[PDB]
Design a protein around this nucleic acid. Structure first.
Ligand code: MG
Ligand code: MG
Ligand code: MG
Ligand code: MG
Ligand code: MG
Ligand code: MG
Ligand code: MG
Ligand code: MG
Ligand code: MG
Ligand code: MG
Ligand code: MG
Ligand code: MG
Ligand code: MG
Lengths: 50, 61, 354, 63, 60, 153, 107
RNA sequence: CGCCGCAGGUGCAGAUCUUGGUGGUAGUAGCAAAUAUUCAAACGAGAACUUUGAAGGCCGAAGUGGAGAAGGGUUCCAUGU
């Protein structure tokens, strides 16, 4: 909602910031083994815990 | 051109605080250059100045 | 189709006076540049002399625009080119024996005339300049003489590139990586026909094959370093910008719109400098460049202790002989080198004159 | 090409609905260049964007 | 417009801008961005021009 | 790459190939059998006619529920259809094979489709929603196609 | 010549008979386009917007019984297109349809 | 891996067996609740579906309108693919 507490807004801020693709230069690191961010979250698919 | 802990140790509180202030104004300038494009040389000095501030503060404490 | 070519007598004559006005201001710059002078002072007086000379010329016709085609670019001992400080930027004082690289262009009726020359200020009488600096300027001038000889319809643009690479390898030096000469026509400085200098894989495969054609101008550039040829930036403000009329965008800034209109009024498509305004100019330029209305001409630094030289000039391509309209004052009697040229083909081209 | 932004901005500037916004079908390229409400105002002044009249609902029959 | 520490209040922002830029400020508006950074709109005094202050800061 | 049925001599032959092409495997298999053995000019004219619904491909093996048409009588069959997407995909592969023939330097006015094969590609997963809170698959059935054209006049 | 123009009258009532209410005017334009393909022999038929407005003048189900059109076969002027010619069909307002023949018309 | 001994979590067709994969069904059922689309043009490799214009219709102010609470959490807005 528009009305939110500071704790809720700060929780939503961190969830937003980590919902981004991996940098492309990660894939060139030695012994990488990581293809893409498997923890990507879409707002419509999966709802947040709170 | 760097700062080291050993040659900071003979200095007095006033000139240690002055050296802390000069590093802090340079770090703020580097953060300005970071958000205005800047250069790779200016971006890489951010860590150098940040470690210098930690070095001065460690000696002070 | 509507471009104007050099087949007309009046177009020929105004090129001759366009390079004449370019040569006399470069000559005035070289004499005036000495020890204890300010680069900002040189840029302003070199620009001011252009303004009054191009204003007093053709007093009977006051309709067609005349002005600067490239701002005075003075780079000394650490910068490649595209360097012109503002008033706020700290000045550079000229020490003894510094090599300086001066760029200067002037356009009449939309056709440009671009000249540039590298020289060392305050050459003492009775002495001889010796060092690793001795070879870079001399080899660059031999590139200018070579390109002057081999500019002709039928000689491919690639033959220019490996010839410059060959003489650079003769002097055990390398050019600046990926510098760009251009083919010139009316009201443009960035024609599609282009010449690459010291390429790599990326540049050579994005570059084009072309054959020299009659009735067109060539701003050919030699630019050789004494180190590795690599370049980058060191947090210095970009001053030279040029308007690209291909694209447009709705500017949402009042100061940027006023700045962009003043660019269109004075320097409609030719490159300009931020010195020609200042507080609002540096404000509107960023939001114009962000949406790519102006193409930045950034400053390029080599590593400390390296020295770089350059020459460039506009040569008209006319069938039975090409002529160099603008020339810089280079004299090989007062300047020698510790290594020479050892290729017979290079000997043939230098000895045969146009 | 697509003028969904320009119709929305024109309706807000003209204080009407998107029903009443008329964008010139022939000056499509000019209108597409307008990405600001002030550019929209310039096109409205120049006649490239017109506010259409209200659909007639006469009361003559009722009277 | 500045990005400021989320703990700083308007009085601290006002004094911090005044000290390390040597300018006088009129009022400070403050919001917290959706990504969690606090943003401060620091209006300058009428005799201070925000254009050339941003020039000497280096963000023009 | 490994084609099945390598050409009898790889000097008068050209090849083309596609993988994970998002067309129905069953429709494309029937279209491929229709143009197999055709001259390249005849196959192009026929595939364009299938799109225009002037000629049909006979559905011989995957004919469950396929309707009847008058144009199936051209073949010895009764059921036929006009798979537009299969015809377009085979027309792209025929243009690619024809350009490959020009690169090999062999004339394209005598090319004959001597080999053509449609294989099943890995399926792509989607979902459909059923009556009582159930989920069922909505799989796509893409296909690999390979063809070899050889000159004979 | 192939830049001929002619005025026809089309019995829309004849070609619309039996069509459902919500399809009568869409089918009238399909039949007008099919009429122009038959008479002028060009696959590219372009219905004029006045003609479209005339067919839909009385709504979707009460299409006019007769319409007086004019077929104009013209060169495409886009040789990149597969069609050398196209037929532009326009609307000819008339007060009555009695004794109206198919007529060749000038320019 | 053979031979002499030693020791087993030691042999599968089943268990509505467990996990994984794949068929026929089958190019089948189906993509049928709330009246409805049409013409021209633009962009574009490509247009029944995008955009603009022109028509014809619907919601009919207890709206298919304009705004909020809860809930969502960036879905908002530009640009590009
Ligand atoms: Mg939900
Ligand atoms: Mg607040
Ligand atoms: Mg059956
Ligand atoms: Mg059935
Ligand atoms: Mg369902
Ligand atoms: Mg359910
Ligand atoms: Mg067991
Ligand atoms: Mg088993
Ligand atoms: Mg069915
Ligand atoms: Mg159905
Ligand atoms: Mg109604
Ligand atoms: Mg509502
Ligand atoms: Mg949106």
């Amino acid at each position: 909602s528009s009305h939110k507490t500071f704790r809720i807004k700060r929780f939503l801020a961190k969830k937003q910031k980590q919902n981004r693709p991996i940098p492309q230069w990660i894939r060139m690191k030695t012994g990488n083994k990581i293809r893409y961010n498997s923890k990507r979250r879409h707002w419509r698919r999966t709802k947040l815990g709170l | 051109a760097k700062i080291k802990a050993r040659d900071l140790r003979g200095k007095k509180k006033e000139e240690l605080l002055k050296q802390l202030d000069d590093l802090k104004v340079e770090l703020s300038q580097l953060r300005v250059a970071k958000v205005t494009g800047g250069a790779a040389s200016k971006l890489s000095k951010i860590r150098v100045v940040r470690k210098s501030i930690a070095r001065v503060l460690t000696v002070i404490n | 189709q509507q471009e104007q070519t050099i087949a007309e007598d009046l177009v020929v004559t105004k090129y001759k006076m366009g390079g004449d006005i370019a040569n006399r201001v470069l000559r005035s710059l070289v004499e005036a540049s000495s020890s204890g002078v300010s680069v900002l002072s040189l840029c302003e007086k070199g620009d001011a002399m252009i303004m009054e000379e191009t204003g007093k010329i053709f007093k009977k016709e006051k309709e067609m625009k005349k002005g600067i085609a490239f701002p005075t670019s003075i780079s000394v001992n650490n910068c490649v080119c595209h360097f012109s400080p503002l008033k706020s930027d700290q000045d550079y004082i000229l020490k003894e024996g510094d090599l300086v690289k001066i760029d200067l262009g002037v356009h009449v009726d939309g056709f440009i005339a671009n000249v540039a020359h590298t020289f060392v200020v305050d050459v003492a009488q009775g002495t001889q300049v010796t060092g690793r600096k001795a070879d870079v300027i001399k080899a660059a001038h031999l590139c200018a003489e070579a390109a002057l000889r081999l500019v002709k319809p039928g000689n491919q643009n690639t033959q220019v590139t490996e010839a410059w690479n060959k003489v650079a390898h003769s002097f055990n030096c390398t050019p600046i990586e990926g510098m760009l000469s251009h083919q010139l026509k009316q009201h443009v400085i960035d024609g599609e026909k282009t010449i690459i200098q010291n390429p790599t894989d990326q540049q050579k495969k994005d570059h084009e094959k072309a054959e020299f054609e009659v009735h067109e101008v060539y701003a050919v550039d030699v630019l050789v370093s004494s180190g590795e040829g690599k370049a980058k930036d060191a947090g210095q403000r970009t001053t030279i910008y040029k308007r690209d009329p291909s694209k447009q965008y709705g500017l949402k800034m009042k100061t940027s719109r006023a700045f962009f209109s003043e660019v269109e009024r004075r320097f409609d498509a030719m490159p300009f400098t931020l010195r020609a305004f200042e507080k609002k100019a540096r404000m509107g330029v960023v939001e114009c460049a962000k949406h790519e209305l102006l193409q930045p001409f950034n400053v390029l630094y080599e590593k400390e202790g390296e020295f770089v030289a350059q020459f460039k000039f506009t040569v008209l391509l006319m069938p039975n002989g090409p002529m160099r309209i603008t020339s810089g004052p280079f004299e090989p009697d007062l300047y020698k080198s510790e290594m020479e040229v050892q290729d017979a083909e290079l000997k043939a081209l230098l000895q045969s004159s146009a | 090409s697509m003028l969904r932004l320009q119709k929305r901005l024109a309706s807000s500037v003209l204080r009407c609905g998107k029903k009443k916004v008329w964008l010139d079908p022939n000056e499509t390229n000019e209108i597409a260049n307008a990405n600001s409400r002030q550019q929209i105002r310039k096109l409205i002044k120049d006649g490239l964007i017109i506010r259409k009249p209200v659909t007639v609902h006469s009361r003559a029959r009722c009277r | 417009v500045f990005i400021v520490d989320v703990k700083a209040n308007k009085h601290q922002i006002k004094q911090a801008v005044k000290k390390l830029y040597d300018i006088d400020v009129a009022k400070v508006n403050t919001l917290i961005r959706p990504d969690g950074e606090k943003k401060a709109y620091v209006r300058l005094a009428p005799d201070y021009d925000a254009l050339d202050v941003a020039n000497k800061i280096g963000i023009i | 790459v490994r084609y099945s049925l390598d050409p009898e001599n790889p000097t008068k032959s050209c090849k083309s190939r596609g993988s994970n092409l998002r067309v129905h495997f069953k429709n494309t298999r029937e279209t491929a059998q229709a143009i197999k053995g055709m001259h390249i000019r005849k196959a192009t004219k026929y595939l364009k006619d299938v799109t225009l619904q002037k000629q049909c491909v006979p559905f011989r093996r995957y004919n469950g529920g396929v309707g009847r048409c008058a144009q199936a009588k051209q073949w010895g069959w009764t059921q036929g259809r006009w798979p537009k997407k299969s015809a377009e995909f085979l027309l792209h592969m025929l243009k690619n094979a024809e350009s490959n023939a020009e690169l090999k330097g062999l004339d394209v006015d005598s090319l004959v489709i001597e080999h053509i094969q449609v294989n099943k590609a890995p399926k792509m997963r989607r979902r459909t929603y059923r009556a009582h809170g159930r989920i069922n698959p909505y799989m796509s059935s893409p296909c690999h196609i390979e063809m070899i054209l050889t000159e004979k006049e | 010549n192939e830049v001929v123009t002619r005025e026809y009258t089309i019995n829309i009532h004849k070609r619309i008979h039996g069509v459902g209410f919500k399809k009568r005017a869409p089918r009238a334009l399909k039949e007008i386009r099919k009429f122009a393909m038959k008479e002028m022999g060009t696959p590219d038929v372009r219905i004029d917007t006045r003609l479209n407005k005339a067919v839909w003048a009385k709504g979707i189900r009460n299409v006019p019984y007769r319409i007086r059109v004019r077929l104009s076969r013209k060169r495409n002027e886009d040789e990149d297109s597969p069609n050398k010619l196209y037929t532009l069909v326009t609307y000819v307002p008339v007060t009555t349809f009695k004794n109206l023949q198919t007529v060749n018309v000038d320019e």
